[model samples]
Target: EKLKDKVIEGLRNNFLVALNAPTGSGKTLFSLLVSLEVKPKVLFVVRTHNEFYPIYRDLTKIREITFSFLVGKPSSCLESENSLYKADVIALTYPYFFIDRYREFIDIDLREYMIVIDEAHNLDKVNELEERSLSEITIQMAIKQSKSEESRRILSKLLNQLREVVLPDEKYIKVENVPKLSKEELEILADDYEDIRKDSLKQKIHIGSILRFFSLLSIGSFIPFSYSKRLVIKNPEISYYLNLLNDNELSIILMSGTLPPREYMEKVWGIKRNMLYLDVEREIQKRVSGSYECYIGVDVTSKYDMRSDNMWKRYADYLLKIYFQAKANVLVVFPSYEIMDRVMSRISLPKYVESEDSSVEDLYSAISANNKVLIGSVGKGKLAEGIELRNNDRSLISDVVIVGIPYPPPDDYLKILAQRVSLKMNRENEEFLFKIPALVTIKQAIGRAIRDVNDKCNVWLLDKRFESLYWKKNLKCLNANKMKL
Candidate 1:
């Protein structure tokens, strides 16, 4: 209530606060408190791709704040459902707030509204999927970097690692149909389609058509690696809908722990003028918080230079040491599937093992009995960043250890998730020459260790070069006590 009163006091004074707080730091509760005072058409903006249900559960529990969800312009919601826009609080992601689709980029005007930006860290323009964003260049390097050193040496003919695809400028060029397959291949495709139709026992294979469409989209454009893959239009019709919200009064209250420095955001968005800001790092001290120990072993000698054959074996040994030492169910979270699988081949965990692709509840059940090792992706799987673990609940998989792969974000879903929270990293270090964004991502990947103050667990960065200033500057949450191999 005291926090609520202070938030209300600031709002009543016409102050716009940049409410920055750690994850699970009651920021949601705090901001909801402020909403009661300002009450300007509420626009709750979350950075995560899927946050509606979670936010709905929270606000619905609060009787004082009643609002409806506004499924943005590009959404399938009917006109009537959109009337929810008129409710006291409207929740949405950034694509609904500021993407520009009109002929003119400055086409939308937000007049007088209050937008509470959650996970503000993920909204970095540099992290966006559009071309020319730092994320694209970083991928170019990663694609190059992921190759073997032998490949690198032989590929000197390569200038910049990743090349952006370019289409012929003529409009007719895009209207062309795909090339037809050979008669033999076509016959096989037809036979496969017929088999699928028979399984469905339907006159028309609508599901078959849907499946075909998925295949087409995946291979033609939606595929993560194809040349056509970069045209990312999957987010809500961001540009179109944001333009539609021109007259709405827009006062933003961006909140989160991972949010980049305000200066970076202001510069990227060209946000001109000083606005009020509030950072509540101290809140974690009082909350049902937890801290997990972290071990950062900098294998500067090997780093990414080692082959996957050598890497996985080395990683497995280090991983086993930590798991046995902790003597509990362990989650070894990696950044990539290749890394996870490679290590899986090298290490044999007794009892049970599960991948991130499996059902979370199923994994939870498997680990419910006792000590187990769960291998999964850091940002994904049952224990992904957003999963809510109660104060008394240890992962059903007892000893949890996250082993991360070194890579940067701005990947398909990651581009949409990085813009939350205000983590002011020192990116411009004279000592570093490589990419800062990638380094920051590595830091964040390791940070998954300490979810709160009270949740004690250990986080280990198996990659040694990670100890470089390149990564250290971005990981301010760490100290020597938390450092080990």
Candidate 2:
């Protein structure tokens, strides 16, 4: 009770409070307590679409505080527009909060609410949301969407430039420029962009890519990078969009289980404000028996120099062993989809693989058709991060086999991020850029198998690096045993 009071008071007095709470440890309760006591109006911002239910669940306990949540595509979501004023506490995903529903709430001051941002680590660095892509096909489609001759003239310029742009082949290279759309031409295109966007509602077509690209580019400060026939622009200065979060009148609480150091908020988000940092540790008493039996195999590694067809065969054998021995649904998380397919091909199993285009429902439907499932998924993708399959109020998956240390792909995206972090923070870029994201992905993947305290799974960490001190500490596998096989 006292702890609750302190956390609430810390936010009330300080305005900004970073809550480092454990996973499944009543974080919503704390967020609610803080928001209720600090301010009458509350906004709960979650990183993922599936995270709003817990907020709604906790709000039910407080009969006086009415709550509503926003979901679905932003283009035609009138319900989301209505949700802004419908309740004392409103919950929404990041995109809705920032992009889709932002205009609806602008008339109503954001400073009126005590905003609780869950999974705040996702904002540690600007994610894919801060990016826009333009391709020749996109421009060609934009030309089709254009109702006016002036808009077509502008799109023709874009298409011509896209054809001329020398994009890297299946890789990324930083570009020093953008399309040569004159200020006068862009002004004319804006009306058509709006027309295309408004018409998108009835057609259920994606016509905003060209407009989104132009809109973001017009604001400038975004760096352009080319990746395999597309021009991608990224706004690295995430704070520019979220500076309102630092408002003194608006009480804010940033909560995360896998919270980074407090300095990251200042360094990454650029929130240089006086705030209270709460690192609430659980009492280390007798070991509360683990929800899953875990083992890290020292024989295998996903290191670059060691990747081969021979090595893949061993990975296949290991997974085949788990499939037969465990005798239950298994989720095998790989570092990449390419690796996932390669490893799965060597094994003889009826498997469902996750695709970038697939949604949670789509993936679930594909897997549900079978009596048994060998689910192959990428560590950082939708399946690993958001999938929760259950049967009889328990986890459907009983074996969570993580085939490798899910490192960030050594792509141009990662390279650019690492370069930026190294220059800006002067910290060990590897730990911040690579290890933290990898560990978070792995943890999220493992969590798919055990949603409840009663749920259980056998976790296989098929990387030798899991034995390292950093991995052991972060993964809470300090005493994790070695694989017998």
Leading candidate by TM-score: 2
**What tens digits encode model 2's per-residue C-alpha lDDT throughout 12-102?**
7765788766546567877786677777889887877678788778888874577877665554544221655757888776765565335
Against the hidden true structure, what lDDT does model 1 obtain? Answer: 0.46
Instruction: Evaluate residue 377 in candidate 1 and report its C-alpha lDDT on the 0 to 100 scale.
Output: 50
What are the models' TM-scores?
Answer: 0.59, 0.83
- Strongest candidate by lDDT: 2
lDDT of candidate 1 at residue 445, scale 0 to 100: 43
Per-residue error (Å), model 2, residue 210: 1.5
* lDDT per model vs. reference: 0.46, 0.70
